[PDB]
Design a protein around this ligand. Structure first.
Ligand SMILES: C=C(C)[C@@H]1CC[C@](C)(O)[C@@H](Cl)C1
Ligand SMILES: C=C(C)[C@@H]1CC[C@](C)(O)[C@@H](Cl)C1
Ligand SMILES: C=C(C)[C@@H]1CC[C@](C)(O)[C@@H](Cl)C1
Ligand SMILES: C=C(C)[C@@H]1CC[C@](C)(O)[C@@H](Cl)C1
Ligand SMILES: [Cl-]
Ligand SMILES: [Cl-]
Ligand SMILES: [Cl-]
Ligand SMILES: [Cl-]
Ligand SMILES: [Cl-]
Ligand code: NA
Ligand code: NA
Lengths: 297, 287
C-alpha cells in the first residue's frame, strides 16, 4: 500500500498528514522550518512494521493556519496531536518529535500520558530545561538569537521570504553540519511548503506565543509532570541551536525506562544524516518487549 | 584635577569630564558604560593631553531626547563634531570603544578634517558589520541581544528589575575575570543606569541603527575610506564581536593602519590591560 495524503478535523482545525503502513500508530512530528517531508527517509522503512502518520503541524504546509499569535500556544499544539490520535481511530500512539515536534511530544507525554505509549525525541530540549537554563546561559542565549529575531511583528517574515526565500534558505543551510545536506531539489520542495499563504507567519507565531522574552526571563517556575512512559532520545551533538548545557541531567525529567543515543558527528537533523541508524534505534525501541520472562531463550 | 562640565552641542546638553592641557583627546564610551569606563586612562593621558570623556546622547548626565529616531548614528556623530567645536577646537584625537568606536569610525570617515588620529577599541567598522553580519552565523549568535533589544518596553523591564540584576549578570559574564568590577564600581554603574530615561535611550541606539531591516539590507552602505592614521586595539575574547568582523580592513582604510591584538582580553580591553592600552594610545599619538 503506498503513501497516502489525508486531511482530518482536529481541535477546530483541518490538519494534513501523510500515512503509510499498518499496525501500531507511530506519529512523526516535524519542527521549524520543515513539514512532513523531513521524515521522507524514515516513513517507508518504518511503514514496514507500523502505521506511520506524519502530519503538518498547525500553521504549516497544507494544514490550517489560524490568525493570531495566541492560536499557537503550546497547549493548543498539543491538543491538536491528542485530537489527531482520536481522529485516526486510535487511543494511543508512539510519538516521535524533532525540534518543535519534540517540544510538543515532551508536552503531550507529560500532560496526557494516557495517549502516549512510548516517546522518542530527536534534538529538542525538554521544555523545563530550556525555560530554567536559557536565561542563565550565554551560550544558549547566543544560539537562540533567532528566537529574539522572530519576536518582531511582520519584518522577520519579509526578510526570510525576500529574493525567493534567500535568507531562510541561507539561515537553514548554515544550521547544518554539511552545507549540502539538502539538494537544490529538496530546497524547491521546501520553498513550495514555505510559500503556502500565511505559512511563515504561522510558523514564527510558535516563537511569539511560547518563547517571548517575558516567558524566557520569567520568574515564575514551570510545573511539568515527570515523564512516565518509556523514552528514547536521539541527539546529534553538533546542534547549532541547542547547547549541550540544556541536556545535562536530562534523565531527571523521566521516571520510566530511558535511553539516549548520541551522534557525535551529526547536528540538529540526525534523521537526515544517519537515517538508517535512526530508523533502527526507533524500531528496536518500539518492538522491545516490556516484559522479560525468557532470558537467553 | 578632573573637572565636570556641561556644554550645548547639536541641540542637546552634553556632560563630560576633562583633565589636562594640550592636544584635545576625546575618549568615547559605549554600552552599557559612560565616561567612567575610562577611569584608568584619564589621569595618565591627562599628563600630556587635554582629555575629554563625554557621556554620549542618552547616557548618564547627558540629555536624553525621546524617540528612537533621535538615536540615528548621523545624529550621534554630529554630537561629537559639535562637541569638538564647542570645546574651542577644530580637530581632536578621537578614541572610541564599542558604540563610541562606531561613532568614531563614522566621524572620521565623513569628517577627516576633524580627526587628527583615530583609535578604535573593540568596535567593528560599520561597513564591515553591515556587509558581513547577515551572512555570519557566529556574529548573528553573538548579536542575540541586538534582536532582544528591538522589542519595546520588555527589555528595559528585564534588564532593570531587581536593581539591574540581569544587566549586571550579563555584563559580568562578558568579562575575562568575574571580579573585574568591585562592588563600588557596580554601585557607580547602577547610579548611571538609573538616570531617568537612560536605559531606554541606550537601547534606542540598537533600535535606530541595528534593526533587522538595516542588518539584512542588501543595499550597499556608502562609507568613505578612512584617511587619517588609525590604531585598532582588539581584545580577542570578545563575547559580542566575532573576529570575523575585524579581519581584512584594507578596503576601508587608505592611511597608516595598525592593529594590536590582546589575545587574553575580552570586550573591555581598557579595563583588563589598562596600562598597555594607555601605552599603545600614547605612543601612537606621540609618533
Ligand atoms: C521551543 C523551544 C524551547 C525550542 C527551542 C530550540 C529550537 C531548536 O528552536 C526548537 Cl527545538 C524549539
Ligand atoms: C531560520 C533559522 C534562523 C534556523 C532554521 C533551523 C532551526 C533549527 O529551526 C533554527 Cl537553527 C532556526
Ligand atoms: C555595528 C555596531 C553598531 C556595533 C555592533 C557590536 C556592538 C558590540 O554591540 C557595538 Cl560595538 C555596536
Ligand atoms: C546587556 C547585555 C545582554 C550585554 C552586556 C553588555 C554588552 C557588551 O554591551 C553586550 Cl554583551 C550586551
Ligand atoms: Cl494520496
Ligand atoms: Cl542524564
Ligand atoms: Cl555520529
Ligand atoms: Cl520484566
Ligand atoms: Cl558623573
Ligand atoms: Na550554559
Ligand atoms: Na563569520
Amino acid at each position: 500500500e503506498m503513501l497516502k495524503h489525508e486531511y482530518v478535523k482536529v481541535n477546530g482545525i483541518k490538519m494534513h498528514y501523510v500515512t503509510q503502513g499498518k499496525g501500531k500508530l507511530l506519529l512523526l512530528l516535524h519542527g521549524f522550518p520543515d513539514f512532513w517531508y523531513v521524515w521522507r527517509f524514515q516513513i517507508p522503512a518504518l511503514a514496514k512494521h507500523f502505521r506511520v502518520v506524519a502530519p503538518d503541524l498547525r500553521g504549516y504546509n497544507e494544514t490550517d493556519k489560524p490568525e493570531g499569535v495566541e492560536n499557537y500556544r503550546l497547549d493548543l499544539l498539543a491538543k491538536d496531536i491528542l485530537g489527531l490520535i482520536k481522529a485516526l481511530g486510535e487511543e494511543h500512539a508512539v510519538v516521535v518529535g524533532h525540534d518543535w515536534g519534540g517540544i510538543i511530544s515532551w508536552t503531550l507525554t507529560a500532560f496526557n500520558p494516557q495517549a502516549v505509549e512510548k516517546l522518542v525525541i530527536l534534538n529538542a530540549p525538554h521544555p523545563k530545561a530550556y525555560m530554567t537554563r536559557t536565561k542563565n546561559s550565554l551560550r544558549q542565549l547566543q544560539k537562540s538569537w533567532y528566537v529574539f529575531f522572530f519576536q518582531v511583528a511582520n519584518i522577520p517574515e519579509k526578510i526570510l521570504s525576500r529574493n525567493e526565500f534567500a535568507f531562510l534558505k541561507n539561515m537553514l543551510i548554515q544550521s547544518f553540519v554539511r552545507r549540502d545536506l539538502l539538494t537544490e531539489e529538496d530546497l524547491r520542495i521546501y520553498v513550495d511548503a514555505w510559500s503556502k499563504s500565511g505559512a511563515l507567519t504561522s510558523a514564527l507565531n510558535y516563537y511569539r506565543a511560547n518563547l517571548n522574552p517575558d516567558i524566557i526571563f520569567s520568574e515564575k517556575t514551570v510545573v511539568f509532570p515527570k515523564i512516565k512512559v518509556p523514552t528514547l532520545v536521539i541527539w546529534g551533538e553538533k546542534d547549532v541551536a541547542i547547547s549541550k548545557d540544556l541536556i545535562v541531567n536530562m534523565e531527571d525529567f523521566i521516571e520510566a525506562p530511558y535511553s539516549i543515543k548520541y551522534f557525535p558527528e551529526c547536528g540538529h537533523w540526525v534523521q537526515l544524516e544517519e537515517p538508517e541508524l535512526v530508523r533502527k534505534h526507533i524500531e528496536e525501541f518500539i518492538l522491545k518487549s516490556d516484559i522479560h520472562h525468557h532470558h537467553h531463550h
